[PDB]
Design a protein around this ligand. Structure first.
Ligand SMILES: CCCCCCCC/C=C\CCCCCCCC(=O)OC[C@H](O)CO
Length: 245
């Protein structure tokens, strides 16, 4: 198990997070983005696919027994998330046309990240014997399914705000959106923090930190957008963290 490529992957993954904050301006593929584009369903399909296929391939070489290592089962949860993100979320996506340029970078991210998380958990990660009863797992797994529930529940609420083909932004109403503008982001952030907690691993903590930086900035700009574009937007709402930010 080479420890040098691992520390480097977590470094870039963190440096990326820092870089996204330095630019301050959003990644520009949704709201603040206004023949160089392609359908968003195909875009997010291609972008997020590596973060599924690579861990799926890594898993496919391991024995089939749930009565086995914790690092494998956790990698399965990573695979379960990006299965939804690719084949369910992305293929049902109702977003505007996506910039072709960003796909290769988005794909590059999900490739390296998929390699990092998958390689570490199998070849590097080492867990004690009573991990499934440990508070880090029992809470970490809890936070994971909690955040995923929130992330998917909110992405669906957002999806039902449009008919396919529509170019429009309506005020997101419904569960947990009543408190924060970026409810789906809140969920995903909760999801990876718990994931880092359940794996107790450096590269997972890094990806969680990136997601916090990226989606946390994305949430803020979304919050800005609503306050800028809707005179009757609920002013009790916050950007990301309820009653705080
Ligand atoms: C020996 C342990 C010393 C450090 C104790 C820290 C306790 C957790 C405190 C804050 C993190 C909470 C939010 C993030 C969830 C935890 C994931 C994590 O940090 O795991 C990395 C692990 O420590 C790599 O050895």
């Amino acid at each position: 198990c080479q420890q040098s490529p691992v520390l480097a992957g977590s470094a870039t993954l963190v440096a990326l997070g820092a870089l996204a904050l330095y630019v301050a301006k959003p990644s520009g593929y949704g709201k603040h983005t206004e023949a160089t584009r392609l359908p968003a369903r195909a875009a997010w399909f291609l972008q997020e696919l590596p973060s599924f296929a690579v861990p799926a391939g890594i898993l496919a070489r391991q024995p089939l027994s749930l009565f086995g290592p914790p690092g494998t089962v956790l990698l399965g949860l990573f695979c379960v998330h990006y299965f939804h993100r690719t084949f369910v979320y992305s293929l049902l996506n109702r977003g505007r046309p996506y910039p072709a340029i960003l796909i290769l970078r988005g794909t590059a991210f999900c490739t390296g990240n998929g390699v990092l998380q998958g390689y570490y958990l199998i070849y590097c990660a080492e867990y004690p014997d009573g991990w499934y009863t440990d508070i880090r797992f029992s809470l970490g797994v809890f936070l994971f399914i909690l955040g995923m529930g929130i992330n998917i529940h909110s992405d669906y609420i957002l999806r039902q705000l449009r008919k396919p083909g529509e170019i429009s932004y309506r005020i997101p109403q419904g569960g947990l959106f009543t408190y924060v503008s970026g409810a789906n982001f809140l969920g995903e952030i909760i999801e990876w923090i718990g994931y880092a907690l359940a794996t107790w691993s450096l590269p997972a903590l890094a990806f969680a930190f990136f997601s916090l930086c990226f989606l946390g900035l994305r949430a803020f700009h979304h919050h800005r957008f609503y306050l800028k574009m809707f005179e009757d937007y609920p002013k009790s709402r916050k950007a990301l963290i309820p009653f705080i930010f």
